[PDB]
Design a protein around this ligand. Sequence first.
Ligand SMILES: *C/C=C(C)/C=C/C=C(C)/C=C/C1=C(C)CCCC1(C)C
Ligand SMILES: CCCCCCCC/C=C\CCCCCCCC(=O)O
Ligand SMILES: [Cl-]
Ligand SMILES: [Cl-]
Length: 267
Amino acid sequence: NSMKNIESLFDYSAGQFEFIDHLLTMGVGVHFAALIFFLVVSQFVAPKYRIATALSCIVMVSAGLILNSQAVMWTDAYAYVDGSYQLQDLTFSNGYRYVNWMANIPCLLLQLLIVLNLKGKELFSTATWLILAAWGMIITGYVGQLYEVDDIAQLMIWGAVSTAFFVVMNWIVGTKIFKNRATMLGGTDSTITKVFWLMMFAWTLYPIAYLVPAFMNNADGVVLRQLLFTIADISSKVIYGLMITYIAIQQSAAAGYVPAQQALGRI
Ligand SMILES: *C/C=C(C)/C=C/C=C(C)/C=C/C1=C(C)CCCC1(C)C
Ligand SMILES: CCCCCCCC/C=C\CCCCCCCC(=O)O
Ligand SMILES: [Cl-]
Ligand SMILES: [Cl-]
């Protein structure tokens, strides 16, 4: 897949190359720092919601590992030769992110369903439809990106199909959020709508990143895409995870769980 991606087409200045390495490395640190926070804080979440914080830990590690791997793959792929970072071998590709999404997107959605107070059959069926829609979106996008170098029209049609799945997934998310807001405790009925908007914003960055080959096919475009994934990853995983956990603790306290109450009170 490395020859199928635009990164393989260029030599990089030291500035471009190092900035990309630094973005990815910084992303690793952010996710792992957040992982410690979610871990320590899970003790203050009621059993009914605790799986949500646990899912944030799994997401932080999954994301951090993939970012770590991307950083090593990048440094393995290029060597500074004759004044520029030049491709030495086929080690780098964005495909690994997509594969990872097959696991992370379902986790991110499930945590949302949990704090929404869905349970039993509704939880199971909603999770099923959502993950199918997510998988449809990710798989079609993965295929489309295989054509970013030699067939832009194909990247676009796979993108369109993928976008249909995204739109339908968003409809399910939005509908469940807006219809279940009233069940939310401790003022979280307000907070949860912000979570919806945050997802719409952050998730929308990925398709933009996906289209960079069509509109900025050059080395600075490669930098821009990595920058966009970095903003998106932190918003969709970390900020989103902190909001989910806040909602979970807040609901836990309102429901009578003492450790949550002590926690909010100690701060
Ligand atoms: C933690 C990672 C997340 C939240 C990834 C989200 C990815 C998307 C919403 C991807 C969407 C895409 C489209 C809607 C069309 C182009 C192909 C994709 C898969 C990038
Ligand atoms: C919401 C999460 C925020 C993510 C923070 C990302 C940190 C970097 C932000 C801006 C730095 C831009 C400077 C780019 C200089 C380009 C160097 C080059 O390519 O030659
Ligand atoms: Cl409980
Ligand atoms: Cl990921």
